[PDB]
Amino acid sequence: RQSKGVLLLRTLAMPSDTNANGDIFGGWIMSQMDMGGAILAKEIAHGRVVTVAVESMNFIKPISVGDVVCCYGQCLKVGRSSIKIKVEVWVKKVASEPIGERYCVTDAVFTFVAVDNNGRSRTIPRENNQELEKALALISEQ
Amino acid sequence: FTDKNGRQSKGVLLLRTLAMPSDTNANGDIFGGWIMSQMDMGGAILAKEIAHGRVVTVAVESMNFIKPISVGDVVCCYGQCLKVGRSSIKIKVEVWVKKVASEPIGERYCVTDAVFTFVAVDNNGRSRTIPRENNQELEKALALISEQ
Amino acid sequence: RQSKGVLLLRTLAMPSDTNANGDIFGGWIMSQMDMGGAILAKEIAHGRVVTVAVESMNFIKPISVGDVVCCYGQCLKVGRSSIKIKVEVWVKKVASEPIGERYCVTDAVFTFVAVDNNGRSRTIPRENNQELEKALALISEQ
Amino acid sequence: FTDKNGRQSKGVLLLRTLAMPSDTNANGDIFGGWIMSQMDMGGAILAKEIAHGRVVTVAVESMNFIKPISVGDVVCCYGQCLKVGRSSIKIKVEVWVKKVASEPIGERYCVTDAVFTFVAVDNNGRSRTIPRENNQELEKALALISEQ
Amino acid sequence: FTDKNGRQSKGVLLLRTLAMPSDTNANGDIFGGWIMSQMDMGGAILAKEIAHGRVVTVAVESMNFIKPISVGDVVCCYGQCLKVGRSSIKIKVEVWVKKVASEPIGERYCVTDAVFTFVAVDNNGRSRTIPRENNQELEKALALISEQ
Amino acid sequence: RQSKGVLLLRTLAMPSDTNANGDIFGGWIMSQMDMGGAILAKEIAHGRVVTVAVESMNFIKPISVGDVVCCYGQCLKVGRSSIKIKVEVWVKKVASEPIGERYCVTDAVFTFVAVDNNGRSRTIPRENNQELEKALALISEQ
Numbered sequence: 001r002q003s004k005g006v007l008l009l010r011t012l013a014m015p016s017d018t019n020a021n022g023d024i025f026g027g028w029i030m031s032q033m034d035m036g037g038a039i040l041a042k043e044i045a046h047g048r049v050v051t052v053a054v055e056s057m058n059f060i061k062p063i064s065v066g067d068v069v070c071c072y073g074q075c076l077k078v079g080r081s082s083i084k085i086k087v088e089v090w091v092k093k094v095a096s097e098p099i100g101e102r103y104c105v106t107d108a109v110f111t112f113v114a115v116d117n118n119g120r121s122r123t124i125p126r127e128n129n130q131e132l133e134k135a136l137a138l139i140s141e142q
Numbered sequence: 143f144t145d146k147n148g149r150q151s152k153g154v155l156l157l158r159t160l161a162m163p164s165d166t167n168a169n170g171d172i173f174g175g176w177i178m179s180q181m182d183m184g185g186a187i188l189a190k191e192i193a194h195g196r197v198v199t200v201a202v203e204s205m206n207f208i209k210p211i212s213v214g215d216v217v218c219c220y221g222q223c224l225k226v227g228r229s230s231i232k233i234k235v236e237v238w239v240k241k242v243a244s245e246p247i248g249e250r251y252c253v254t255d256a257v258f259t260f261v262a263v264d265n266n267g268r269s270r271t272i273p274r275e276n277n278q279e280l281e282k283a284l285a286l287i288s289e290q
Numbered sequence: 291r292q293s294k295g296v297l298l299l300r301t302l303a304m305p306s307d308t309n310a311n312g313d314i315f316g317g318w319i320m321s322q323m324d325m326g327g328a329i330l331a332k333e334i335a336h337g338r339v340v341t342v343a344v345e346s347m348n349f350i351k352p353i354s355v356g357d358v359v360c361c362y363g364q365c366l367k368v369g370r371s372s373i374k375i376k377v378e379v380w381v382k383k384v385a386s387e388p389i390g391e392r393y394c395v396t397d398a399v400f401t402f403v404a405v406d407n408n409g410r411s412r413t414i415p416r417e418n419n420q421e422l423e424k425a426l427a428l429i430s431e432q
Numbered sequence: 433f434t435d436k437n438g439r440q441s442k443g444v445l446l447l448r449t450l451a452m453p454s455d456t457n458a459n460g461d462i463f464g465g466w467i468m469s470q471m472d473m474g475g476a477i478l479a480k481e482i483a484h485g486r487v488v489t490v491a492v493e494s495m496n497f498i499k500p501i502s503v504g505d506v507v508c509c510y511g512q513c514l515k516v517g518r519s520s521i522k523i524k525v526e527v528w529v530k531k532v533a534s535e536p537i538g539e540r541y542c543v544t545d546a547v548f549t550f551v552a553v554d555n556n557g558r559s560r561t562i563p564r565e566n567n568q569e570l571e572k573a574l575a576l577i578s579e580q
Numbered sequence: 581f582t583d584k585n586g587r588q589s590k591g592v593l594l595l596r597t598l599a600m601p602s603d604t605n606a607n608g609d610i611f612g613g614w615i616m617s618q619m620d621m622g623g624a625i626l627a628k629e630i631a632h633g634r635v636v637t638v639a640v641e642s643m644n645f646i647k648p649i650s651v652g653d654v655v656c657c658y659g660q661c662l663k664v665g666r667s668s669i670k671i672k673v674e675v676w677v678k679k680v681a682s683e684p685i686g687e688r689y690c691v692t693d694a695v696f697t698f699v700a701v702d703n704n705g706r707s708r709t710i711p712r713e714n715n716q717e718l719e720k721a722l723a724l725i726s727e728q
Numbered sequence: 729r730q731s732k733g734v735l736l737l738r739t740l741a742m743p744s745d746t747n748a749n750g751d752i753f754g755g756w757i758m759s760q761m762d763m764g765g766a767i768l769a770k771e772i773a774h775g776r777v778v779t780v781a782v783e784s785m786n787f788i789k790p791i792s793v794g795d796v797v798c799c800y801g802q803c804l805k806v807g808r809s810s811i812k813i814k815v816e817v818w819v820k821k822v823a824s825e826p827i828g829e830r831y832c833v834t835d836a837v838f839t840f841v842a843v844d845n846n847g848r849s850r851t852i853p854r855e856n857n858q859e860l861e862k863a864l865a866l867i868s869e870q
């Protein structure tokens with residue numbers, strides 16, 4: 001298995017990211033995915049976006065403080081105001097052996113909505129939007 | 143908590159948190175991921191109570207966010223345990239908001255809900271059997287399920 | 291002893307809340323009380339409030355990282371611009387035995403002042419203020 | 433530090449801190465609780481110096497906040513040890529501000545002060561006797577009291 | 581990454597970070613010190629990979645910051661190992677930005693770069709010999725230097 | 729060796745300041761220096777300043793969580809929009825013996841630039857600027 005999508009965030013898991021027990025917890029990973037996914041969404045949407053939905057998720061492997069956490073992003077659909085982005089979470093191991101090993105922690109599809117200043121949906125511009133063109137072209141394969 | 147449609151919060155209050163500047167995305171908006179984080183953290187308090195020790199998250203079901211939250215709003219996570227297996231515990235978390243930043247001030251609404259699946263683990267991250275003898279938190283959870 | 295007031299904040303004591311030694315310290319508790327008390331004050335005041343005063347306080351029991359910390363709020367007086375709120379701090383134990391036990395850590399009365407945009411005192415509105423009515427009605431017993 | 437009324441800071445500088453965005457309440461205001469936190473943290477530096485180890489807070493006296501603080505202002509906590517008992521230490525903390533955000537820029541004023549009571553404890557949180565033999569920090573504190 | 585002058589990023593991506601509200605100075609600006617912090621943290625990931633354990637920073641060379649960064653912009657640190665000695669490792673860190681907050685949106689530029697010197701240390705902070713037998717990270721680093 | 733300059737920041741090294749390994753790292757110290765140096769720069773500049781440059785630096789001693797960290801500031805030159813500030817970093821030991829000992833960790837010269845609202849350089853006002861006068865007078869000795 002190889003990563004799919006563009007790299008969105010590459011983040012060290014820090015002590016301030018853990019729960020009270022010192023474990024990197026699922027919520028922190030969900031939060032990285034949402035934040036990272038939205039970078040790509042905003043790029044395509046040319047402005048403010050919000051998360052309207054996320055698909056179910058399974059966490060297959062643990063993450064330790066010190067480990068490097070990568071979020072990868074793949075736009076699957078662009079609607080009028082909505083954008084579906086698939087986010088994969090990959091870890092490069094630092095804290096314990098085998099050091100340097102890369103593994104997939106989870107993935108999920110997020111749906112974002114392009115919004116105006118008042119929080120209402122807006123049409124993603126289609127004219128002179130090369131971020132949208134790049135995304136559609138990638139979908140037209142996959 | 144009770145909304146315009148007459149829905150009421152279900153379960154026990156896990157967390158009651160103010161949405162703060164340091165919780166927003168870079169644009170200053172309260173974002174899905176922060177809510178997701180609060181749900182997991184809050185759900186796991188209940189799961190750890192029942193499990194009698196360390197728990198990890200293995201699954202979360204799909205979620206929709208129906209209404210935005212502003213900085214300054216009060217954000218509440220309520221939990222109900224829906225299933226306890228050998229080492230697994232399913233907790234449904236509802237997120238309720240009490241409006242502070244914008245009118246109508248004081249309005250309550252439900253932003254989202256979702257079932258989290260947690261697993262009781264030891265120190266090595268290996269699954270462990272939830273203790274069923276003399277577990278008052280579990281008995282209370284199971285009585286709640288027979289009733290709900 | 292039972293809690294008195296409405297629940298204002300329910301917060302996990304986190305590693306990022308400790309002093310440099312890893313102890314939950316009195317300052318953090320004072321800070322929660324002030325923040326939590328002010329929620330109720332703002333409700334009644336219908337806008338911006340600041341803390342003008344806090345009564346003396348004693349810390350009777352320690353709090354451990356992992357423990358759940360609850361602030362409870364009881365409005366004792368509403369003046370023209372000032373509001374006195376009694377805050378109690380209760381802990382539900384997670385970190386050590388007995389697990390699940392609830393105890394009172396401290397309590398104190400905070401005085402808040404309703405302020406305008408420039409930091410000057412303003413009259414708390416008395417007309418169509420059901421938060422004020424609820425508070426006054428509770429005082430008329432308690 | 434010296435204000436318009438001619439008051440001057442008393443004691444030793446414990447902390448010198450910028451009021452930051454992440455220190456505000458949700459409205460963006462620097463709030464009482466953050467100042468209270470800084471006082472306790474800063475006072476305890478002096479208390480730990482004298483006590484020769486771990487200290488906890490047992491009491492704080494009443495406090496008034498006379499003037500607001502803006503984000504960007506410099507906030508200083510000064511401490512004077514007023515009493516050392518067997519295991520207890522009383523530290524008076526004054527909070528001084530140097531104005532940055534708003535005019536008059538550079539003005540200094542005292543926001544609040546209060547006496548904190550700390551107790552020297554061991555690892556189990558049990559009170560311990562402050563060492564009185566060969567304690568230069570204590571000797572300095574006591575000489576300051578006879579004079580301050 | 582590729583700018584208007586045709587410069588391209590050199591090395592491996594160490595960190596890819598959003599500039600957040602909580603990273604600014606009190607005025608809300610992204611400041612030199614935060615960038616400096618990210619460079620050191622990111623450079624040390626590569627240094628620790630090669631060194632096979634703990635590393636500390638002993639030196640940083642001079643730096644200029646050519647262009648400001650806004651909150652919301654994506655900030656990337658790229659690293660190239662330039663020298664490995666007995667216990668020392670020199671990593672050049674370039675900071676690249678992808679514009680988000682302001683036009684032109686999506687533009688990439690290099691804010692700064694600088695060489696950090698790290699030292700491989702044990703648990704007591706004492707320098708240790710970087711292992712040269714069976715060190716694939718070191719072999720890769722050295723092959724990159726002979727080429728680049 | 730004695731400290732030189734005015735005290736700019738006096739900060740406890742906290743757990744949330746460490747890298748993922750729990751070490752106070754050079755980046756955090758650089759960040760304190762830049763922040764602290766800029767206080768003095770803003771004072772003299774009478775408004776917004778940014779960092780355009782920093783000199784090379786060497787870190788001679790380690791800092792432990794719990795230790796007190798002081799940044800000291802000495803303005804070396806005022807140009808039209810630029811200000812050179814020398815920052816020294818001193819530690820008073822708390823975490824390990826000898827407790828109370830003070831040592832110098834590093835020093836470096838930072839160059840700040842006075843900027844307007846749009847990020848462009850502006851002339852530091854020379855009229856009715858007693859912060860500038862104090863700095864120039866200190867330079868005239870150093």
Ligand SMILES: CC(C)(COP(=O)(O)OP(=O)(O)OC[C@H]1O[C@@H](n2cnc3c(N)ncnc32)[C@H](O)[C@@H]1OP(=O)(O)O)[C@@H](O)C(=O)NCCC(=O)NCCS
Pocket residue numbers: 050051052053078079080081082083111113115119120121172173174175177206207208209210211253
């Ligand atoms: C997102 C939001 C504006 C959509 O409201 P709305 O009344 O349905 O707006 P619209 O009818 O214009 O729908 C906008 C788009 O979202 C899509 N959508 C709505 N609900 C959806 C859901 N549950 N799942 C997937 N797509 C959804 C619509 O089909 C539409 O798509 P399109 O424009 O590509 O055709 C509103 O639900 C909201 O503000 N939610 C909170 C968002 C938020 O702040 N999240 C952060 C965490 S709280």
Ligand SMILES: CC(C)(COP(=O)(O)OP(=O)(O)OC[C@H]1O[C@@H](n2cnc3c(N)ncnc32)[C@H](O)[C@@H]1OP(=O)(O)O)[C@@H](O)C(=O)NCCC(=O)NCCS
Pocket residue numbers: 024025026029058059060061062063105198199200201226227228229230231259261263267268269
């Ligand atoms: C928790 C973990 C040890 C379970 O792994 P495992 O090999 O499947 O162990 P088990 O097969 O015994 O499963 C334990 C329980 O979880 C349940 N479970 C496992 N995978 C599940 C899934 N994806 N969805 C729902 N339930 C699941 C099992 O049915 C089992 O239930 P039971 O004991 O009540 O009958 C493992 O998946 C893990 O360590 N994941 C990382 C968790 C984590 O750190 N998450 C947060 C950040 S990544």
Ligand SMILES: CC(C)(COP(=O)(O)OP(=O)(O)OC[C@H]1O[C@@H](n2cnc3c(N)ncnc32)[C@H](O)[C@@H]1OP(=O)(O)O)[C@@H](O)C(=O)NCCC(=O)NCCS
Pocket residue numbers: 340341342343368369370371372373401403405409410411462463464465467496497498499500501543
């Ligand atoms: C709060 C503040 C506006 C009051 O200033 P002021 O000149 O006394 O204003 P007023 O005379 O209008 O007094 C306002 C109310 O506060 C009350 N008050 C003033 N000082 C008080 C004190 N020490 N204790 C209790 N109440 C007090 C007054 O009696 C009056 O009450 P009322 O309107 O119900 O009759 C001013 O002291 C201030 O801005 N302080 C700093 C507040 C702050 O920012 N705190 C956060 C931590 S720094």
Ligand SMILES: CC(C)(COP(=O)(O)OP(=O)(O)OC[C@H]1O[C@@H](n2cnc3c(N)ncnc32)[C@H](O)[C@@H]1OP(=O)(O)O)[C@@H](O)C(=O)NCCC(=O)NCCS
Pocket residue numbers: 314315316319348349350351352353395488489490491516517518519520521549551553557558559
């Ligand atoms: C510190 C603590 C062990 C002291 O408890 P204790 O049973 O009263 O122990 P002692 O009776 O020996 O009191 C120790 C000293 O504190 C003083 N003291 C106790 N309570 C006090 C009070 N409420 N106000 C002022 N001084 C007080 C005593 O007079 C005694 O003084 P001395 O040794 O100088 O003569 C205890 O109260 C505690 O652990 N509280 C929690 C502290 C804490 O964690 N606070 C921060 C967050 S909750």
Ligand SMILES: CC(C)(COP(=O)(O)OP(=O)(O)OC[C@H]1O[C@@H](n2cnc3c(N)ncnc32)[C@H](O)[C@@H]1OP(=O)(O)O)[C@@H](O)C(=O)NCCC(=O)NCCS
Pocket residue numbers: 610611612613615644645646647648649691778779780781806807808809810811839841843847848849
């Ligand atoms: C600082 C900045 C405005 C200067 O741009 P500029 O086009 O050179 O502006 P100027 O020509 O007016 O130069 C302004 C001053 O800086 C000085 N300066 C410029 N580059 C310098 C450098 N590398 N080292 C020292 N001084 C420098 C100039 O000599 C001039 O000094 P003076 O007014 O006292 O005579 C621009 O480089 C910038 O915005 N950089 C990013 C700053 C930033 O945001 N840093 C935070 C971390 S990213």
Ligand SMILES: CC(C)(COP(=O)(O)OP(=O)(O)OC[C@H]1O[C@@H](n2cnc3c(N)ncnc32)[C@H](O)[C@@H]1OP(=O)(O)O)[C@@H](O)C(=O)NCCC(=O)NCCS
Pocket residue numbers: 636637638639664665666667668669697699701705706707752753754757786787788789790791833
């Ligand atoms: C790392 C440290 C142990 C090295 O100290 P030392 O007594 O000089 O040890 P050494 O003489 O063996 O030097 C180790 C290596 O660093 C190099 N080095 C030392 N000082 C240097 C300097 N100031 N500039 C560039 N390289 C330097 C040496 O040349 C040597 O290289 P080599 O092993 O590849 O041949 C020490 O300086 C230290 O603990 N400093 C604190 C580091 C720290 O905590 N920084 C972050 C926050 S303060």
Ligand SMILES: [Ca+2]
Pocket residue numbers: 099100
């Ligand atoms: Ca290896």
Ligand SMILES: [Ca+2]
Pocket residue numbers: 159160299301
């Ligand atoms: Ca809180």
Ligand SMILES: [Ca+2]
Pocket residue numbers: 247248
């Ligand atoms: Ca109302």
Ligand SMILES: [Ca+2]
Pocket residue numbers: 389390
């Ligand atoms: Ca029990």
Ligand SMILES: [Ca+2]
Pocket residue numbers: 449450737739
């Ligand atoms: Ca600071």
Ligand SMILES: [Ca+2]
Pocket residue numbers: 537538
């Ligand atoms: Ca002036």
Ligand SMILES: [Ca+2]
Pocket residue numbers: 009011597598
């Ligand atoms: Ca991040």
Ligand SMILES: [Ca+2]
Pocket residue numbers: 685686
């Ligand atoms: Ca564009």
Ligand SMILES: [Ca+2]
Pocket residue numbers: 827828
């Ligand atoms: Ca000593």
